[PDB]
């Protein structure tokens, strides 16, 4: 990177106060060079804080700038630690309003390598307590480093940059420690910096200091770029400037448009709930009256949010004519002791559909882009299509203009959208401020590339997020990414975008902790690659152990939403846990029945009423199902939804092993027939097994002879022999049938 990287890599000299000895043309040569070393940004990101670097001569405690003679503070503690007072020394950085440093003058800065470290030490402190503080200083990051090297094998690192305080202190540094100690860390941070910057010491550091290096490094040529910016967002007399500039460009676009246009550009911005009568007034005569007596709340199909909109879509009917409007309402709640109907489930199911919000974006992130998929109805289907097709061709302004450069947008969301299973424990649950490190890592671990299938709208300036919205993405779009400008201070940017998750620490935003999914865009093209190119290594690496024809397609992928970099890559643990607990001879034997009918282990992040391995082989749309777990005979394959947490399923792992077991209750159904495609569970020798002990293990234990087994077997496996043994003690009145069929399938 050459050229202008000098105009804007020195011009910042607009802080270079040279009250230097009249003897012209030297010092600068020294000053310029002296400063050359210190990163470019980390200079400016000082200017925008009262830019001024005093380079005067001789007696320095004389210069106007230094008149606040804190004679007490005058006892200048030197970087090494040897006491010393102003007069003597040659460069004190005075703090406070319009912070400043007074670098002494002498052609001797190039050579002398000490008053070269100090001038860096200071200009570093002036970076740890000030600049890199108005953001929130070294938070969790520089903490670890700041400790892993406090308790590292070779008790030496410490020795380099610490004190009895930090060195002797018991265990290790813990967040809170950033309390009335920020006046110590800040220093250790400096020293670290102070070194890495100085030419010779980068070397001495590197070796003597493990992690200090890297952190202190990264952060100076690849990470700084940020701090400067997440510090421009702080000040605001620009926070607008940006806003303005970014509009300007996008402005002309916003001018000529249309109501129709600016219209759906809204239809998108906000859903459009169903209707009141129109919906109801669209049912049948028979359908209408059926809708009355429904025992309504009983089916775990209709979630509260919409369950209510149904009891309500009921009153708009009951609110009509004769007395039975008073009596049926009573005579109906009479035999209100029987759960539900089988001719009515549908009567509601077929509704569970039509009563849907229609957000051309909650049914886009619902099908990776399958705007053509049979998850919804026929015409609805054809709208989004018609629509998503228009908006697309609607947002067509490149971006990168003659105005703004590397510019990042933002967005906040909740870990419950990526991986709800971790959602639960994301935040401490015992400090609602402190994020549970534990589940933190588990999150970050495999998160390198995320893709948003849908239309992204983004806050163009860190906007404080809510209380459940806990992730703060600082995505860095790029020249050529297309978006729109939505007054409000928010940009909508096209469909199908790629994001290389290039860092994910955790910050402190106004007394509360936050996860920072800071990323950067890349082409989905380059992303889908990394997937299949991985969809293989999994298969191949599995086909072996499993024992199938090299080059088969068992574990198939389907990830399009924000957590592929773990949607897919997770798998490994899932499957690996499937093998581990069960007995080889089994799965090897059965994983074949399935493949014998070209079935898969579909790890998906879209929605089960969209995953192919189930919809064409479905039957009728009025039905669908969806969730973590799923089993489908018509296409004997396993569908496992990555995000969604489970109804008493501690994790993805234990949700699969179950589901698969459901396929086992399929084996017998063929390992015992020519054409009675049944399920070991659909037997008279089993119905009993169910109508006796079929309700003892847990909640799921019911609703279907089958699932009592799925969960039964699911249980017999537990990471701990306990949870399983319970099935033995509880109802061997099944715990035998399982093991019986197990060591019944292992052979043919």
């Amino acid at each position: 990177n050459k050229t202008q990287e000098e105009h804007l890599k020195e011009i910042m000299k607009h802080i270079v106060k040279i009250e230097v000895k009249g003897e012209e043309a030297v010092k600068k040569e020294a000053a310029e060079k002296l400063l050359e070393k210190v990163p470019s940004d980390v200079l400016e990101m000082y200017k925008a804080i009262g830019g001024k670097i005093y380079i005067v001569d001789g007696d320095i405690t004389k210069h106007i700038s230094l008149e606040a003679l804190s004679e007490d503070k005058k006892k200048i503690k030197d970087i090494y630690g040897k006491d010393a007072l102003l007069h003597e020394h040659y460069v004190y950085a005075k703090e406070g309003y319009e912070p400043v440093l007074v670098i002494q003058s002498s052609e001797d800065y190039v050579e002398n390598t000490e008053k070269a470290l100090n001038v860096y030490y200071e200009i570093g402190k002036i970076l740890s307590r000030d600049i890199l503080s108005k953001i929130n200083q070294p938070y969790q990051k520089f903490l670890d480093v700041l400790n892993t090297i406090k308790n590292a094998s070779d008790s030496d690192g410490q020795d380099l940059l610490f004190t009895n305080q930090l060195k002797e202190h018991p265990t290790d540094f813990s967040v809170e420690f950033l309390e009335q100690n920020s006046n110590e860390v800040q220093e250790v941070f400096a020293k670290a910096f102070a070194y890495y910057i100085e030419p010779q010491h980068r070397d001495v550091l590197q070796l003597y200091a493990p992690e200090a290096f890297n952190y202190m490094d990264k952060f100076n040529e690849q990470e700084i770029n940020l701090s400067l910016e997440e510090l421009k967002d702080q000040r605001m007399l620009s926070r607008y400037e940006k806003w303005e500039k970014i509009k300007q460009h996008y402005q002309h676009w916003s001018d000529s448009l249309s109501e129709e246009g600016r219209g759906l550009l809204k239809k998108l911005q906000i859903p459009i709930e169903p209707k009141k009568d129109d919906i109801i007034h669209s049912l049948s005569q028979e359908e209408k009256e059926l809708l009355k007596r429904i025992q309504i709340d009983s089916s775990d199909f209709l979630s509260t949010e919409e369950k209510e909109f149904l009891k309500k879509l009921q009153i708009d009917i009951r609110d009509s004519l004769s007395e039975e409007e008073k009596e049926l309402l009573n005579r109906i709640q009479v035999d209100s002791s029987n759960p539900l109907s089988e001719k009515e489930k549908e009567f509601l199911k077929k509704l569970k559909l039509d009563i849907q919000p229609y957000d051309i974006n909650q049914r886009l992130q619902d099908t990776g882009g399958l705007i053509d998929s049979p998850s919804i109805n026929l015409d609805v289907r054809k709208q989004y299509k018609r629509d998503i097709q228009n908006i697309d061709a609607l947002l067509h302004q490149s971006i990168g203009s003659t105005l703004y450069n590397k510019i990042y947008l933002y967005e906040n969301m909740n870990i419950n959208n990526l991986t709800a299973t971790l959602g639960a424990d994301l935040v401490d649950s015992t400090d609602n401020t402190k994020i549970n490190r534990g589940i933190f890592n588990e999150f970050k671990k495999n998160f390198k590339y995320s893709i948003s299938s849908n239309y992204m709208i983004v806050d163009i300036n860190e906007r404080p997020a809510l209380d459940n919205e806990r992730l703060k993405w600082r995505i860095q779009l790029s020249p050529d990414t297309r978006a729109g400008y939505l007054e409000n201070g928010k940009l909508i940017l096209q469909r199908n975008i790629g994001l290389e998750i290039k860092d994910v620490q955790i910050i402190k935003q106004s007394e509360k902790e936050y996860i920072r999914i800071d990323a950067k865009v890349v082409p989905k093209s380059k992303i889908d690659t990394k997937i299949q190119e991985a969809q293989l290594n999994i298969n191949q690496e599995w086909n072996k152990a499993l024992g199938l024809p090299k080059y088969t397609k068992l574990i198939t992928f389907n990830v399009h939403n924000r957590y592929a970099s773990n949607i897919v890559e997770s798998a490994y643990l899932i499957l690996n846990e499937w093998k581990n607990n069960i007995q080889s001879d089994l799965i090897k034997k059965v994983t074949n029945y399935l493949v014998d009918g070209n079935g898969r282990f579909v790890f998906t992040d879209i929605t089960l009423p969209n995953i192919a391995e189930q919809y064409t082989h479905q039957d009728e749309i009025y039905e669908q199902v969806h969730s973590k777990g799923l089993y489908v005979p018509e296409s004997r394959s396993i569908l496992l939804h990555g995000p969604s947490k489970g109804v008493e399923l501690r994790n993805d792992s234990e949700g699969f092993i179950h589901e698969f077991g459901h396929a086992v209750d399929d084996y017998a159904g063929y390992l015992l027939d020519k054409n009675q495609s049944d399920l070991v569970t659909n037997s008279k020798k089993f119905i009993d097994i169910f109508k006796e002990e079929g309700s003892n293990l847990t909640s799921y234990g019911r609703t279907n002879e089958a699932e009592f087994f799925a969960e039964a077997f699911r249980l017999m496996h537990s990471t701990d022999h306990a949870e399983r043994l319970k099935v033995q003690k509880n109802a061997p009145k099944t715990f035998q049938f399982i093991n019986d069929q197990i060591k019944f399938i292992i052979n043919s």
Binding site: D300, S303, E306, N417, E623, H626, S644
Partner: peptide
Amino acid sequence: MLARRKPVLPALTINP
């Protein structure tokens, strides 16, 4: 706000 969450569940599949 960007949720919905409970798209559906079983029955027994009900037809031939």
